[PDB]
């Protein structure tokens, strides 16, 4: 669903889908080719 985001103070609008890649456990978020946040770790449980 297209919804508004507030993730640890960072805001955006998008659709949450499951990441198939291998990520760092200490990673808060990550950036695209345009340096905007395309992926973010969930704060309560560990999922990106």
């Amino acid at each position: 669903k297209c919804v508004n985001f507030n993730f640890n103070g960072l805001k955006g609008t998008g659709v949450l889908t499951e990441s198939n890649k291998k990520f760092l456990p200490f990673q808060q978020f990550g950036r695209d080719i345009a340096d905007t946040t395309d992926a973010v770790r969930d704060p309560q449980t560990l999922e990106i």
Binding site: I33, A34, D35, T36
Partner: protein, 48 residues
């Protein structure tokens, strides 16, 4: 008919090997490849 039929087959052997004869059409794509990657890299700039 010996000279003309051998002359068409030298064009087909040249285009199957040398790729730089079609590179004038490849500069049409590569100037547009830098143009569409221009506006992506401007979004990461802080602009002051």
């Amino acid at each position: 008919a010996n000279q003309f039929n051998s002359a068409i087959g030298k064009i087909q052997d040249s285009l199957s090997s040398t790729a730089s004869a079609l590179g004038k059409l490849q500069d049409v794509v590569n100037h547009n490849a830098q143009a569409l990657n221009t506006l992506v890299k401007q979004l990461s700039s802080k602009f002051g």
